[PDB]
Amino acid sequence: AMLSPNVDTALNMLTDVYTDFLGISNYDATCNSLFIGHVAKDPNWLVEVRSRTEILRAVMNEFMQQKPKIFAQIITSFINYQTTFDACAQNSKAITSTKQWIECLQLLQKTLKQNITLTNEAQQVFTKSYNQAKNAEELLASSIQDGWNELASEEQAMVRIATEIGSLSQSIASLGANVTAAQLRAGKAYIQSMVTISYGVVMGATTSVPFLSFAGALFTVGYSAYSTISSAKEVQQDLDKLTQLQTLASEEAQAAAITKAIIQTLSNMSEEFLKIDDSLPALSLLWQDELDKVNELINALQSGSDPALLTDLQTIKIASASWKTISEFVQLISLPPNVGKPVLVNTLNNTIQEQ
């Protein structure tokens, strides 16, 4: 236990930070790109969904108003500590008085308390937005449930259409790249492209018309998003079975099934990126661990322990290398990601690029 965290541990946690904040931004983009058409006077349940999705849109836009500041603070926290820590580490043990060691280590103490405070405050932003999103998603679930209850005759047809839509989304998501610290460190470049699925519905069993459009981000390496989506057999298979399943249902029941599947996807991504993949709690405990070790060392040298026998000080120049490696990483993930050309998936069964 040096004055440093385990490096592999810290990088994987920073990778989670970097995928989570990317996920939040893309989720926000998904919320603000959601489009629902008309032709066919809106049923009551769709009037309700339009309003309640708008609330969810507002909740995530409010969070985005703070996300840049929150992300910047995380990056700065690691840049500031490594710089301060590197200044301590240079102290040649030969000519560095114990009073000097105490001084520079107390500057570490000051920064760590800063870092802990700003991390906890950011975590409160997450919990505020998470609870807001959950309440909004509960209103969405009620509306679509009431809509399905107005169509009990077609309930099992709607369940099948919704399931295939969830499967189709999963089949595309399963083509995404695995983002790890090892691969970011090794220079791998991840491409972030938005994939729009345009869900049509059949009118009077005769003509397909647009109903809803929904976009989400897909990460690839090397090849574009279109290259792998257009090449996946599972995707085209899911598209063909969805078309046949939509022939068993009213235009309105088709719409209610699409809407329920999209509501479920929105709810899972908020649960994912605003709570489960929220790594701020683990970030605070990292700083806390370091404060405990620095205060123990400060207490030790103040109270008369012999400095050259305290292992935290014997290894200070190795902990500095760890912090440098960590700071090199946060600067890497601070870059703008690479945006690829978007992909359109239309449920008249075609895959287009640049669209």
Numbering used by the authors: 0 to 354
What does the report in the manuscript say about this coordinate set?
Here, we identify the proteins from the five V. cholerae genes, vca0880 through vca0884, that are coexpressed from the operon makDCBAE and analyze the crystal structures of MakA, MakB, and MakE. For structural analyses, MakA, MakB, and MakE were crystallized in their soluble, compact forms in which the hydrophobic β-tongue is hidden in the interface between their respective head and tail domain. Each protein is predicted to undergo a conformational change in which the head domain is unfolded and rearranged into two long helices in order to assemble into a membrane-bound tripartite complex.
MakB has the same overall fold as MakA and MakE but deviates more from MakA, with an r.m.s.d of 3.0 Å calculated on 328 Cα atoms. The MakB tail domain is very similar to that of MakA; differences are mainly found in the head domain in which MakB comprises a larger β-sheet (strand order β1β3β2β4β5) than MakA. One MakB molecule is found in the asymmetric unit in which we also modeled two sulfate ions. MakB has two additional cysteines, Cys87 and Cys103, which form a disulfide bond that rigidifies the connection between the carboxyl terminus of α2 with the N terminus of α3. In MakB, the program detected a stretch with increased hydrophobicity, residues 194 through 228; however, a transmembrane helix was not suggested. In MakB, the hydrophobic region constitutes most of β2 and all of β3. The pore form of AhlC was used to model MakB and generated a structure in which the tip of the protein has one more hydrophobic side and one more polar side. On the other hand, because MakB is less hydrophobic, it is considered to not bind the membrane directly. Next, MakB binds to the membrane-anchored MakA and arranges itself as a scaffold for the pore-like complex. We hypothesize that the first step, the conformational shift and subsequent membrane attachment of MakA, is the most critical. Both unbound and membrane-bound MakA appear to attract MakB, which would undergo a similar conformational change and interact with MakA but not directly with the membrane.
